[PDB]
Paper text:
In this work, the first crystal structure of a light chain dimer originating from mice is described. It represents the light chain dimer of 6A8, a monoclonal antibody specific to the allergen Der f 1. To achieve this, the recombinant production of antibody fragments, Fab and/or scFv, is needed. This work started with the quest to crystallize the murine IgG1 monoclonal antibody (mAb) 6A8 Fab with its specific antigen, Der f 1, originating from house dust mites and associated with asthma and rhinitis. Moreover, when the 6A8 light chain is not partnered to its heavy chain, it forms a dimer that lacks Der f 1 specificity and interacts non-specifically with a wide range of allergenic proteins, such as peanut, dog, and cat major allergens, as well as the non-allergenic protein bovine γ-globulin.
While this structure’s asymmetric unit contained two protein chains, molecular replacement showed that both molecules corresponded to the light chain portion of 6A8. In both chains (denoted as A and B), residues 1 to 212 could be modeled. The variable domain expands from residue 1 to 107, and the constant domain is made up of residues 112 to 212. First, the variable and constant domains are composed of the classic antibody β-sandwich folding. Secondly, buried within each, there is an intradomain disulfide bond, formed by C24–C88 and C135–C195, in the case of the variable and constant domains, respectively. Interestingly, despite being a homodimer, the conformations of the chains are not identical, with a root-mean-square deviation (RMSD) of 1.2 Å across all single chain Cα atoms. PDBePISA predicted this dimer to be stabilized by nine polar interactions, which include seven hydrogen bonds and two salt bridges, and several hydrophobic interactions. In this sense, consistent with the idea that the variable domain is driving this dimerization, this region contributed around 750 Å2 of this total buried space, while the constant domains are responsible for the remaining 550 Å2. In fact, the superimposition of this crystal structure with an AlphaFold2 (AF2) model of 6A8 Fab resulted in an overall RMSD of 1.8 Å (across 411 Cα atoms). Therefore, our PDB analysis re-emphasizes the uniqueness of the 6A8 LCD crystal structure, as it originates from mice, is the second kappa isoform LCD structure available, and it is not linked, to our knowledge, to any pathological disorders, unlike Bence Jones and amyloid proteins.
Author numbering:
A (entry chain B), B (entry chain A): 1 to 212
The structure:
Amino acid sequence: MQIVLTQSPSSLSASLGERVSLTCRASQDIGSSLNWLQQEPDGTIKRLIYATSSLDSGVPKRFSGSRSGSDYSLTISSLESEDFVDYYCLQYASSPWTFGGGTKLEIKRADAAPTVSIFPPSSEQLTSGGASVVCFLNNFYPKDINVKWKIDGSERQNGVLNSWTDQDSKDSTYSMSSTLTLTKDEYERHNSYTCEATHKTSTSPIVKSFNR
Amino acid sequence: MQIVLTQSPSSLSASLGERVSLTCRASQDIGSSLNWLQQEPDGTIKRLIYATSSLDSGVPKRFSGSRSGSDYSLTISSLESEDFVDYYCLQYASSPWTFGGGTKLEIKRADAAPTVSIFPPSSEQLTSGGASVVCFLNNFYPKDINVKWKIDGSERQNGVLNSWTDQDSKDSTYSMSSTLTLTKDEYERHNSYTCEATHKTSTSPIVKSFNR
């Protein structure tokens, strides 16, 4: 049986100067044999902490590692802007070596509803095969959101491409585009087009629509 | 001894059933103490190979690890669709443990020029926080692309967010949005807005504009 490391939380929202802890629970005893890794935006992975508690050379003092039973914690005493990256626990007590799911440090922000814009497809696009209806969802928080597409009241699930931004460095919000990619034929078959957005900040969905 | 692992190549394009090799050169002797990791797009990390040559339990036979002096190689004999992810070498011969820069496998395809679409901001958007001009660059390959913004012929450098999609599973292309955030005042000061793209597949830059 592979040792499973349950990493808490998956996403952690905090502010500059906050004290935060990442927890990593081992499914079987690994003793002191846990390392803490950091993955930078350039994709590079470093080891911060080894053997549960020990700081690697050059690692800032604000990083510290502890163990409470089968729960291993990385603690950052006072968060800095460089620290809002991905973190992984790694156990090397047993083969195979296994990693936690990871923890993304994210900047905590007041909840924001998305500004929703719906654009019908271009005349240039339309005369060639394709018809893409684009739905913009701008500057919402938190990241968790849902977009439905409706054609003449009826939900359409397929032919939909969703693209998210990372957290905005300026205002700490998320944006996303949903594209309902379609044929010229299909588009002119139906009349009414609606993307509806479901977010924490509204008990009922935000709807944007158009016809011909 | 603090050991540098030089990983080749940084990016690797190949097709289904192709044989590929990753190299990882150690700056100092690490003996057989090198592991090969796989990172899934969701950020999950597995160990495929340990102690240079050994396959971890359940790892497919098409993965193989070898060493030629201080050069350590991961070979995938016949690529499958699940295999087009990130790979890292990891040495544990010396403290601190160090990783290679990484290697992203992508699916090779014919070079594609982006289709450029420009969306002016909504009235709702324009009054409320950011007034966003959005420039879509669709179904281009390779992923590397550069997008400038011009306002009435003058280049705008700040208030621009550039966001990539992962490689499309259907057609192996990349898409990309460039968002020029602007003040309500700034926007209605000027009339002409232009995103201009530099890509391999165009000898000259790709231009989209609109006026008021």
